Structure formats: C-alpha cells, structure tokens
Amino acid sequence: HSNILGITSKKIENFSDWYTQVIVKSELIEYYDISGCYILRPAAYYIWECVQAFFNKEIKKLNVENSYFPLFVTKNKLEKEKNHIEGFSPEVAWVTKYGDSNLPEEIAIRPTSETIMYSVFPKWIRSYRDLPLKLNQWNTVVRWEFKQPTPFIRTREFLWQEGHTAHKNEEEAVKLVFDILDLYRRWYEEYLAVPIIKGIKSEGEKFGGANFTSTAEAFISENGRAIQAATSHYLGTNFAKMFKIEFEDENEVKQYVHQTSWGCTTRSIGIMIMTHGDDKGLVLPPNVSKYKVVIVPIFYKTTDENAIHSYCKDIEKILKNAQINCVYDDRASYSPGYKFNHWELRGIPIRIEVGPKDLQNNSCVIVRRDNNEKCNVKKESVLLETQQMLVDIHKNLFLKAKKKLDDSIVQVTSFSEVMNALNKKKMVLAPWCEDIATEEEIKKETQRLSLNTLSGAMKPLCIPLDQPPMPPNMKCFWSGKPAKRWCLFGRSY
Amino acid sequence: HSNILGITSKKIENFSDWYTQVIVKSELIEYYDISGCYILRPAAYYIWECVQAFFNKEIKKLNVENSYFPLFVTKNKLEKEKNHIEGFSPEVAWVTKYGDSNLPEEIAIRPTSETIMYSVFPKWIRSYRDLPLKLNQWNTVVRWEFKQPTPFIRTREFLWQEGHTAHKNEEEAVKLVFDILDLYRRWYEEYLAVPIIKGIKSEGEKFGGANFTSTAEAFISENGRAIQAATSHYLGTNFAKMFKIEFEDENEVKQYVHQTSWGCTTRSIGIMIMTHGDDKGLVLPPNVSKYKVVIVPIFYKTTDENAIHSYCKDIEKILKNAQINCVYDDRASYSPGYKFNHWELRGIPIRIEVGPKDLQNNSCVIVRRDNNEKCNVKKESVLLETQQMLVDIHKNLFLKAKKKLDDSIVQVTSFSEVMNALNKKKMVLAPWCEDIATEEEIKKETQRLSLNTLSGAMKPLCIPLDQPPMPPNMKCFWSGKPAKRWCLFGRSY
Ligand SMILES: Nc1ncnc2cc(-c3cccc(S(=O)(=O)NC(=O)[C@@H]4CCCN4)c3)sc12
Ligand SMILES: Nc1ncnc2cc(-c3cccc(S(=O)(=O)NC(=O)[C@@H]4CCCN4)c3)sc12
Ligand SMILES: [Cl-]
Ligand SMILES: [Cl-]
Ligand SMILES: [Cl-]
Ligand SMILES: [Cl-]
Ligand SMILES: [Cl-]
Ligand SMILES: [Cl-]
Ligand SMILES: [Cl-]
Ligand SMILES: [Cl-]
Ligand SMILES: [Cl-]
Ligand SMILES: [Cl-]
C-alpha cells in the first residue's frame, strides 16, 4: 500500500481502490492471509462498540436478554432441516480434525444460530407462562462465499448480533419484527448518519424458512449498488414445526410458537464509510469517532511556543471538562499541514487551529471535517460552538447522504425506462406483479442487456413499506399483468 | 436432569453432581451435543457482562484499546513457531472443507491470538513514537482438550479477553503485567467475592514463550483442587524475536519490543459458583445478579389480596426508583414456599416477604440469601436497610470464602508433612529449590503415593508474591538442597 499519507484514488473515478485506501490509511482495518477475513483495528472496533451499546440499550427495553451459544454445531442438527435456508451448506466450514487426530463426527461452524438455539427451545418452553422468549447473541459467524469479498460488506467472518424470539401468537411476534427494524433505522441514522429504506423482500429473495423478511436497504450512489443494511425476519410457525417448539396455551391446547430472527453486522461500518468518505479520506459522524476534536498548534516563532502550548492546553481542558474527548497534537516533528491531512484522513470531526493571531484576538479557528468551512470563535464560546458544530455535522452528513439516496431512486413504469435507469447507476422503483417466476427471468435477462467483478444482474431489492399511490390500470413492468405494488430493483453487493 | 425444583446432592458428599445440578437448575447453563461446549444462558451471560464492563473501564485507563482479529489462522503463521507454546497443536482444531469442497490450505481456529496479532505488529511498529502498543480482544477461542471437561472451568470453547501489549523497555512492560494482575484480583474480589493468591508460575508450568507467567490462583476447598483463575505473562523480547517486532528507539538504534499477554475467562464464573454455592443452589454476589431483591407475597385470605399487592408494589416502586432492580413474584399459581426455593435456587441476594402481619405493623421481612437470617424492617427504612444488606452480603461472602481458602492453605517443611496435607484436600505451601528437573519427579511420584477422573498429581501451582520469612538453613522439601522460596502445591483442575 503506497502513499500511506494520502488518498490517491478519487471516490468517483475508481471507487473500488478509493475504498481500500480509506479503510487502511485511516487505520480502520488491515488485510489478512485468509481471504475474506479482516482485522478490525481500534478505530473500526470503537464504531462497533458505540452501536453495540445503543442496540443493547434499546433491546433491553424490549426485554431481550443476551446470551452465548456454541460456535460449533453437529451435522445432525444443522442438516436436519433442508426445508429452511440450507443454501448455507456450500458456505458452511467444517472442522474435521484436532492436531493430527481426525474427529469421529465432523462439526460445522455456525453461519447462523437458528439450528443451535432452536434445538433447545422445546426444553425451555412448556406453557404460555414461558412465553415470550427473547434472546440475543453478540458473536462471530462464518460464511465461505466464493463471491468477491469486500471489507465490512461481504466477509468470510463477521461480527454481528443475532436476536431470536418466540411468541404466543402472530400479532406479538410481528410487532417485534418491525420494532427491531426501527432500531436498525436508528442504528444507521442516529449513529452512522446513513439513511435506509424499510421494505419486504420478494418471495424469491426471502430468508430460507421465513414467512416474510423485512429489510433495511442502503445504496452506494457512486457505484450504484444496493446493500442489505440490516434484516428482521418473521419466521411464523415454520421453524416451530421443524424443531417441535410447542407450548400449552392459556386454554390447555398445545400450539406452535411464532418466531423471529434479526441481525445486523459490521456491514453497517462499511456502509457508513462508503456513504460519507471523500477524497481526503475518512469522514465520521461525531458519535462514532473517539476524538471529537483535534487541536493543532500553528506557529514558527520560538517566542510564541510557550504561550501557544498553554493556550491549546486551555482548550483541551475546556473540552475534556465537558466530556468531549479530543487530541492535542503538539508533535514538533511534523509540519502543521501533515497534521491537517493526518487527522482529516482519520475522520476527526473538528479541527481547532491555534496561532499567534489567535492569542492576541483571544480566539481560535474551527474547521468542519465534512465541508472544510473555517470560522473564528472567541475562546470563551469555544465549548458551546463546538457542541453545536458536532450536532450540525451530523445533521449535514445525514441530509447530504439522503439527497444522494433520493437522487439515485427513480420511479419508472416501462421496461425500457427501467434499463436506462439501471445502466445510469440508479436504484429503480417500478410496478411489479410479484409473481415469483419473474424473479429469475428478470435477473438473468437484465444481465444479458447490461453489456460492459460483482454480480451484474438486477435483483428485486425490497418492496417499500412506504408505497406511492398505485394507478388503477398500472401494469407490471416485466409481465404486463396488473401490478400489485411498487418494488425496488438494482444491482447488489 | 431430575428434581428440577431442588438440589438433591450435598456440596460436600458429592461435589461433582452438586455443581452440575446448581448450574442447570439455576438456569445458568445448558449442556450441548458437542462435548466441552456449553450454552451460557442469560443468567450466566449477565455475570459475564458485568465483569466485562468493569475490566473494560479499567484497561481503558491504561489506554488499552479493544479490537478484533480473525478467528482463523494459517498453518504457516501458527506452526511458524515451535519454540513458543506449541503444545496447542494437539488441541488446535482444523477446518479442512467448506460444503463438500476441500480447502486448498488447511486453516486452524485460534487457541490464542499471539501468532495472529504479532504477525502484523511489525507493520504497526516502526519507531519509539509508535510505542507503547496496547490491544485487547473480547472473543472466543477453542482448545480441544481430552482432559475431562468441566463447565466454565475447562471447556472446549470459552469466551475470554486476551490483552497484548508491546513496550520500549522492560520496566514499562512488567509494570503493566502486574497492573493487569491486580485488575484480575479486583475482578474476583469486587464482583465475584472470590479471594485469590498472586504468584509466579514455576519454570516448568510457565507459558510457552514467556519470560515469566504471573498468575492468580483460586482454590475449591470442598474437593481440594486449585484453579488458575487468571493469567498475566511477561513475554519480554522472546516473542519480538520470533516475529521480528523491532523499533527504532530515541537514539536511532533498533531494538526488540518487550511484550505482555494476559487473559481471563468465563472460568471466573465457575470459580464464583463453586466458592459461594450451597445446598439450596446458587449464591450470587449482588453485583452480578440481575435482580437484587424478590418480593414474595404471603397470605391466604381473599380479603387481604388487594391490600397486599398494593403494599408489595409500593416496595417495588421504592427499590426501582433507587435503581435497585427487583422482581415482584405475584404468581398466584405457585405456593409461597415454591417461590422461596425458586429464587434462592436462582441466587437472588435478598427476599422481602409481605404478609398481613406486615400491613398492620407497617413493616416487612427481609431474608439474606447467604445465611437465611430474617429481620423485620419498617417500610420507611426498607430502602436504606436493603442497600446496606446488599453490601453486607458481599462483605460476608468474601470473608467466608477467604476463611475457607486460608483453612485450606497449610505451611509445612518436610515431604511427609506435605503428603498428609495433600491427601487431606489442602493446598500446601512448602520450601522449594525451584530446580526444574524436580517438577516432573514430584508430579509423577506423588501420584503413585496418593492411592485412591481429574489428574491426581501434585503440580507446583505458583510461587506467591507474598513470601513468609525463609529460615536460614531451610531445605527444599523434595531435594534437600537449600530452599529458594516458598511455593504452593496441590492438585489442579
Ligand atoms: N456475508 C456477509 N458478510 C458481511 N456482512 C453480512 C451480513 C449478513 C446478514 C445480516 C443480517 C441478516 C442476514 S440473513 O438474511 O442471513 N439472516 C440471518 O442470518 C438470520 C437473522 C439473524 C439470525 N439468522 C445476513 S451476511 C454478511
Ligand atoms: N481450557 C480452558 N477452559 C476454560 N477456561 C480456560 C481459561 C484459560 C486460560 C486463561 C488465561 C490464560 C491462559 S494461558 O496461560 O494459556 N495464556 C494465554 O492463552 C495467553 C494470554 C492471553 C493471550 N494468550 C489460559 S484456558 C481455559
Ligand atoms: Cl481463497
Ligand atoms: Cl426518532
Ligand atoms: Cl446478503
Ligand atoms: Cl512533516
Ligand atoms: Cl449546517
Ligand atoms: Cl468427544
Ligand atoms: Cl481495593
Ligand atoms: Cl490452564
Ligand atoms: Cl406450587
Ligand atoms: Cl454481616
């Protein structure tokens, strides 16, 4: 990796290389011997801890309790269900030995914990007094996917949380499915300044055993690829029937539980980086940056040295007293411009420059990372203006990313309008009959039309919860049948 | 598992079965298809989260930053070092396939992350400005150990934290080694009410590449087996030489870094259960129990029902207003005695009984879990007395466990005195010359003397930091040579 000090690929001209440079030169990640596995350095894992604390706070209000189930799973429990999502079998890593000894029975590594947890649920669930059962895990899962691996986005091994619940009836379960989905929206908006779109995945793309799969969909405008930001399934009684999870209800009749399972991944970090990063490097919402402010001294005269270091330490004291973490870069070995690029690259939201002009005027210079706008601030008002500026940066990052998302969403009706939008790097909202047979024809056929890596087919992303009005005689864009609902389409990571 | 409602094995008469009953009937764990892997239910994982928050708070003060490295490791990096602790090779689980496809290169699952992290350290460490480097992981590791598996104590898969640091010189590193060790002591004392003994492991039992291995040693008096509660290694330059971790110092001379690595495990939970549990089931320090108080109504007259439920809800309001979580068990389906045993079994520190006698006297009955002592408390003073009683329970649990630890420590000098103590289930402090050749002779030979599961040999546990005075002509108990220091010996889990 060359030119460690700066980003030499513009986000638009070469988005792929720009992303690799940002995550490495900002010290978020490091690559690894094993393809698809990545080292989350402290800067990246700080982001994970912030969203982890937030999500834990909110799911505790729903009485979800954390837990930990084994990393390994027997070939019996896992492969016991070929009616659920058994498309993980080609991706399931198998341990076959310890040392030079071979295992008697092979054991797999969890791609997800549905079979591990739900094999014990019948023991914990005997009557309606035992429901609802609400569990969550903060763990690591493994999926061996031949598809091109992308840091944070499609990885062989990723940290996540997987919640699983079971309920007395349908109404209780589905309300939790969407309550979690809104927590995912806050996960992205409040802490990552990333807008998403709530929807319902088509029958073709839904989770294996799910009744339906709700999703939060993000979009990378620069390369026109949607990403499944987070997921919340209503499994209904499907999984309850497979694993014989039954309960005596209030009227002595035995019933199947209604289950959910929801998960969000370090993929949120990748989406955040792609949404806000620019050619100077990493851009962070203040809520996920360890250092909210960096104080850079700027002078040349040896006489000013003593006065300036004290003035900067005054600012460091004001901020840290107000619980605003910050770094005072007083390294004399590096030029002021080196410090500028170094901390812009690391994504520090705010830079406070202090120079001789500042001492006499009793002020400072404050520079927003998102737009590089500078302003003079009297020393007394530094604390308040810094607080309001961290808020304004977050408000600005979200609204800019929302403008880019909406500019990428185009509403069309005909097949030809759809392809023009598709090859212009847009996410297309079109009327669709939702017949499942049309999903594979649409994907396979659009790929043959998009002449000139990642999959080039146009999948159905999600059917938005927010439905624009459907005209009376509107026809599906592909089949010509009467159209049921508007659906989002596009290429995907 | 029979008699789910109570513990049918006395902790002394059958300690092994008593432990299995406690951890399952108190809903801490559930057994699993794969030997050595255990399900940490919410009650057990709440304990993990409390100590996890505490340890994270304190290591952040030392500027240790959390991170996450890959679960997998190549056969090259792992086996590159046969001079370090390569005794993990027989315990290293190997993935050899994904799906029906075989992997080109086999990949292992981390038993520990020394090789994973230290293969990247040279990239992050170029000069003295880059030191100290302080990293930590909250992750899961795997060791396939044929030894008899015990929940929380010796498991195939366990949660832990592994810190790793690198320093400019020896003084900086070793100070951190012992600073972490004291954090482990607070981990056990402050939050688990478990006393431990700081020591230095013998040269025979030290960690693979360590210069020395400091340890915190706990002791299960009932079955007379010591356990390695926590560990903190000074690796010195040993690992720096293996992985070529060098740095340009302040005087332009390249040097090797001085490293440490420290870890503590869910084994702390197992030690806590064994130390405080009694025949009624689980006994918890208040700091690791979700519910500090359980309010049980006790009446028979239908007339009293309305008044009593309001009186109990008043107490629930007082406690929860003071941030003292509690459960008001108003289930009319279960007898009051059922509730008593149910919540004593789950380890709730305090039970507040409310009956008709309480309403007229405007008081309540408070029952300590640790000693079942009951006392009347006027309703007004419930909040204060409850707070002081949670503190007194913790003070009592620690001091009781410390009395049992010290009664199990016996100081002897001759070989025959040592064996009498050994077969009386004691941890023996004896003078020892520390010659390494004597470690395998002592272990192998004491096993042949202890006539009539787990290893029956007497290992050297640790050489305490607190050294009682050594007489002038004191001779090692085994060799007759002049004795260097007092060392602890005993059987181990
Ligand atoms: N390969 C990857 N690389 C990087 N980041 C990610 C994120 C991924 C993902 C995230 C959420 C949900 C799903 S899911 O639809 O498979 N549902 C499940 O697993 C269910 C629900 C949780 C319990 N099991 C997948 S996969 C992946
Ligand atoms: N098999 C088991 N079952 C249940 N609980 C436990 C706990 C165990 C343990 C705890 C602390 C330290 C050690 S260590 O001495 O091996 N040192 C290392 O790994 C170093 C230091 C951290 C980074 N690598 C082992 S092993 C084990
Ligand atoms: Cl590969
Ligand atoms: Cl809101
Ligand atoms: Cl996906
Ligand atoms: Cl410079
Ligand atoms: Cl603004
Ligand atoms: Cl086995
Ligand atoms: Cl103290
Ligand atoms: Cl050990
Ligand atoms: Cl009963
Ligand atoms: Cl007391």
Swiss-Prot record, chains A, B:
Its main location: cytoplasm. The keyword Ligase applies. GO terms for molecular function: Ala-tRNA(Pro) deacylase activity; ATP binding; proline-tRNA ligase activity. GO terms for cellular component: aminoacyl-tRNA synthetase multienzyme complex; cytoplasm. ATP binds at residues 143-147, 154-158, 228-230, 265-267. It is found in: Cytoplasm. The keyword Nucleotide-binding applies. Keywords: Aminoacyl-tRNA synthetase, ATP-binding, Cytoplasm, Ligase, Nucleotide-binding, Protein biosynthesis. It comes from the Eukaryota. Catalyzes the attachment of proline to tRNA(Pro) in a two-step reaction: proline is first activated by ATP to form Pro-AMP and then transferred to the acceptor end of tRNA(Pro). Functions in trans to edit the amino acid moiety from incorrectly charged Ala-tRNA(Pro). Has no activity on correctly charged Pro-tRNA(Pro) or Ala-tRNA(Ala). Homodimer. Belongs to the class-II aminoacyl-tRNA synthetase family. ProS type 3 subfamily. Consists of four domains: the N-terminal editing domain, the N-terminal catalytic domain, the anticodon-binding domain and the C-terminal extension. The first domain (about residues 1-163) is required for editing of incorrectly charged tRNA. When it is deleted the enzyme shows pronounced misacylation of tRNA(Pro) with alanine. This is Proline--tRNA ligase. It comes from Plasmodium falciparum (isolate 3D7). The gene is proRS. The chain holds residues 249 to 746 of 746 of the full protein.
